[PDB]
From a paper:
[name] is the only known factor that establishes the trimethylation of lysine 27 of histone H3 (H3K27me3), a chromatin mark associated with transcriptional repression and whose tight spatiotemporal regulation is essential during development and differentiation. In addition to [name] (or its less active homolog EZH1), the core [name] complex consists of suppressor of zeste 12 ([name]), retinoblastoma-associated protein 46 or 48 (RBAP46/48), and embryonic ectoderm development ([name]). The binding of [name] to trimethylated-lysine-bearing peptides is central to [name] activity since it allosterically activates [name], a requirement for efficient trimethylation of H3K27.2 Upon engagement of specific methylated peptides by [name], a flexible loop of [name], the stimulatory-response motif (SRM), folds into a short α-helix and stabilizes an active conformation of [name] by bridging the [name] ligand binding site and the critical SET-I helix of the [name] catalytic su(var), enhancer-of-zeste, and trithorax (SET) domain.
Cryo-EM analysis of automethylated [name] incubated with nucleosomes containing 40 bp stretches of linker DNA on both sides resolved two distinct species: nucleosomes bound by a single [name] complex and two [name] complexes interacting with one nucleosome and with each other in a non-symmetrical dimer. We refer to this [name] as nucleosome-proximal [name] (PRC2prox) (blue). The second [name] is located distal from the histone core (referred to as PRC2dist) (orange) and interacts distinctly with each of the two DNA linkers, as well as with the PRC2prox. In addition to their interactions with the nucleosome, the PRC2dist and PRC2prox interact with each other via two different interfaces. The EZH2dist lacks density that would correspond to the bridge helix, indicating that the am-loop containing the automethylated K510, K514, and K515 is unfolded. Our studies led us to discover a chromatin-dependent [name] dimer in which the automethylated am-loop of a PRC2dist binds the allosteric site in [name] of a PRC2prox that is engaged with the tail of the substrate nucleosome.
Numbering used by the authors:
A (entry chain A): 68 to 135
B (entry chain W): 37 to 135
C (entry chain S): 27 to 122
D (entry chain V): 28 to 122
E (entry chain J): 20 to 102
F (entry chain X): 16 to 102
G (entry chain R), H (entry chain U): 12 to 119
The structure:
Amino acid sequence: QRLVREIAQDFKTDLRFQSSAVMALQEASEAYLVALFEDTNLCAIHAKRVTIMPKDIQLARRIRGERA
Amino acid sequence: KPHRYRPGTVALREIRRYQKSTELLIRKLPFQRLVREIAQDFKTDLRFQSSAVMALQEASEAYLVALFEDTNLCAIHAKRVTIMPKDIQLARRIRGERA
Amino acid sequence: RKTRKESYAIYVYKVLKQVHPDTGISSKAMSIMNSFVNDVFERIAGEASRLAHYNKRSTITSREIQTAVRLLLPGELAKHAVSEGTKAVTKYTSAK
Amino acid sequence: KTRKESYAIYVYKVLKQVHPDTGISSKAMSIMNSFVNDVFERIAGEASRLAHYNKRSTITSREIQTAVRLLLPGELAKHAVSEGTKAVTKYTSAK
Amino acid sequence: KVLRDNIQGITKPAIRRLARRGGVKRISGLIYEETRGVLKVFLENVIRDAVTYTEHAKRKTVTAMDVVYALKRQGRTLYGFGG
Amino acid sequence: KRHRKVLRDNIQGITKPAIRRLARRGGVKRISGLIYEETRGVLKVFLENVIRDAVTYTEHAKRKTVTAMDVVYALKRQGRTLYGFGG
Amino acid sequence: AKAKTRSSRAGLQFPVGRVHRLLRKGNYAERVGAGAPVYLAAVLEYLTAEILELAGNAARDNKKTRIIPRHLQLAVRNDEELNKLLGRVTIAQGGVLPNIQSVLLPKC
Amino acid sequence: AKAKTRSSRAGLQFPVGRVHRLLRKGNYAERVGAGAPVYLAAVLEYLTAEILELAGNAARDNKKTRIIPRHLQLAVRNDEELNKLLGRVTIAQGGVLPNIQSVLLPKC
């Protein structure tokens, strides 16, 4: 809650949030990261590496196409 | 004793040349002969306009070449300059095309 | 007492007796079906608007919806879906 | 016969507004013709969807202003907005 | 521990739990600064779209409807909240 | 034969140098020999998805010839778009 | 005369009565055929049936009798065509299908 | 009697008359505002003016007086703000941007 309220305050002040609206962000984000982490692991398995490394995500996001 | 190039040197010439040029890379007739073959599996010998085959090709090659952009980028990540099938399987799976 | 809203509440609940006569479903689970069915309705009809536009026609009838669901739904889903609609139209035109 | 339409003339007028010395190839123009048709379908798309959720049946300059707000990145957005309001004010002077 | 950048609000174990759901065996040390970045930028775009919908309606309260509709634009459609 | 044709060996026309050139535009040094048949399948998979959708437009308008207009639309459904054919 | 709904006329459940009026305001074309909502209404019946039939099938395995919103995720992500229809679709309180990579398992 | 097109009214070389008509025809809304198409007509104008300049900017770079499809490919792609706006599109005869990775280069 404190994260989303502060970040939204950059774009406009005096915002109020429906308590149902906030968990909408939460469930959306957790689905997004979990989807990101699964595919990121695939690349780590490809590199014959059990653990993941930060350089896997930029590859993970790049292949998807929204970042680079 | 005849002059040669180290392996891969012909490639780098053929890469920069093909990035510079913009023409379609597959001979028209083999592509034309294939697309009718796929179509006839669905209906009775549909006529293709000459514009359609080209337009069907442009999207495919751009899609296909974009795949090697993803496949080769992953291949570098696996510390191999070569390309391999277990790349091309992994390339589309992050894309969600196979999902 | 105000703002009478529209939901597919009874319909999904009533149709569920086809597969499990006795099983219930959560009130939150009511909303996902409300969101899912409404979502698919948008995409099918949204597709139909374009096919009528491509042929420059002013009416939505069975045929373009028939191809609309033949495009949107992959695999054998459309085949029975065509079958379901084919029975659906026949019953209506028989009792017209 | 066979009267069809295009936006070839209008983009061509735009070019000489900028680089009068250069011409346009036939294939290039249809890309711009399709392109401006593409953006039109997109901007109308979210614009129409916006009016629906708001339970409003009229599309005005506001929805388009919101539409261009969403579709384009910031740098394109703020330039387009400035061009957008500038155009209306010239129109509203002698509408 | 006075108030700081709240992206630190998502804790070191909390991200690890998120990875576990994704079938992750081992987590590197440096992954945590990245996951904040990707969660930051993704949650940046959604609200920016989400806020603008509220601007259009003139309501000062962000609603669940707006967030759902902001997600649809990114193609990350969401169920269970309405519409 | 006056009408109809036999459907065979058509994927074989996508010859190995042709696969090389496609990879060349993307930019690679070494291509494994096993890529050649599989990427042909990928081309087969991608093509049949779009052409089948494209045919359904032709069937809808009752016509029996496939054009550039539908293929432009068929791509639009599958998240891709191509410019230069009067979309 | 006597008032009887069109849903009973066409022998299905989903509201051909409501779909008509809703589609009239839906802003899709100038006109909508009489048979337009009937053909559509079956497709909602077909799609709702399988999704709930699989939702019902998953519930019996977990011994529960109410369809948890989770059950949908555990049923939608097992049919490849239904997964394909909702491939880019996330559902609140959904979790994920159980899976672990082959390599990540112990060597023996 | 002394007619002047709406594009002349705003002095903007875009179909302020025609764009206003297409909004009605596409069934996007029951009503379309008086200022509504005017605002959009400029939006296409600025958007196409910026893309066309960069293509023209590219045209002199290759020493060519006629913009071919290639010069479009550069203009859309080199600038990322247009590029992300066009991340789902391809251009006939567009080709691929000239680039190579460091590892792909020779070892010196």
